[PDB]
Amino acid sequence: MNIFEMLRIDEGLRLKIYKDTEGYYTIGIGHLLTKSPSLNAAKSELDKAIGRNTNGVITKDEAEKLFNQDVDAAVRGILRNAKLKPVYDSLDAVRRAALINMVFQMGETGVAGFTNSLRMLQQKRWDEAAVNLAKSRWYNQTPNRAKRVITTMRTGTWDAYK
């Protein structure tokens, strides 16, 4: 299992613009298009992102390209972040995948905001971090996916995904 396969499980794959859990216009593999209520602002963003007139639909390939850019951006964001970088450096390979997952879903700013949990992770206090991470809107809004991520963080194995 790797970060790509992990995220592909968590986000799914959709070739047509759709609304995410929060109601935002998304496409492909968890690629947020816009927080604007306009399906037209979404189509516009989509066309800009793809470099062609899509009329709200893309191919597998296109979705995969967005996905590759997104994980890359996710990783570079972590490494550029003064709050996140140290945590990441301190982690093993599995846990790193878990933080990348969170960052992809909630943005760098968002994760950087979980001050307490980041401190616990850095101290390798796994169980406690797991407990604190669950006290969040994130967890309450998307409980099954959050539990999977949190389990990966607590254990350092890919069990939740197998």
Q: If binding is defined by CB under 5 A, does position 49 make contact with Cl ion?
A: yes
Q: Which residue among 23, 137, 144, 162 contacts Cl ion (CB under 5 A)?
A: 144
Catalytic (active site) residue 108: no
| Residue 93: alpha-carbon gap to chain centroid | 17
Q: Which two tokens stand for residue 94?
A: 């599995």
Q: Which is nearer to Cl ion, 115 or 141 (CB)?
A: 141
Q: Which is nearer to Cl ion, 31 or 154 (CB)?
A: 31
User: Considering the complex, what minimum distance in angstroms separates the CB of residue 40 from Cl ion?
Assistant: 18
CB atoms within 10 A of CB 111: 24
To the question of whether residue 132 is assigned a binding role by annotation, the answer is: yes
Q: If binding is defined by CB under 5 A, does position 145 make contact with Cl ion?
A: yes
Q: Are 83 and 145 in contact (CB under 8 A)?
A: no
To the question of whether residue 13 is assigned a binding role by annotation, the answer is: no
Task: Measure the CA–CA gap between 138 and 143, rounded to whole angstroms.
Answer: 8
Q: Which residue among 142, 148, 152, 156 contacts Cl ion (CB under 5 A)?
A: 142
Q: Are 138 and 149 in contact (CB under 8 A)?
A: no
To the question of whether residue 32 is assigned a binding role by annotation, the answer is: yes
Catalytic (active site) residue 11: yes
Of 22-30, 93-101, 113-121, 139-147, which segment contacts Cl ion by CB under 5 A?
139-147
Q: Are 29 and 8 in contact (CB under 8 A)?
A: yes
Q: Are 108 and 84 in contact (CB under 8 A)?
A: yes
| Residue 132: alpha-carbon gap to chain centroid | 19
Interacting residues with Cl ion (CB under 5 A): 49, 142, 144-145
Residue ranges of the annotated binding site for substrate are 32, 104, 117, 132
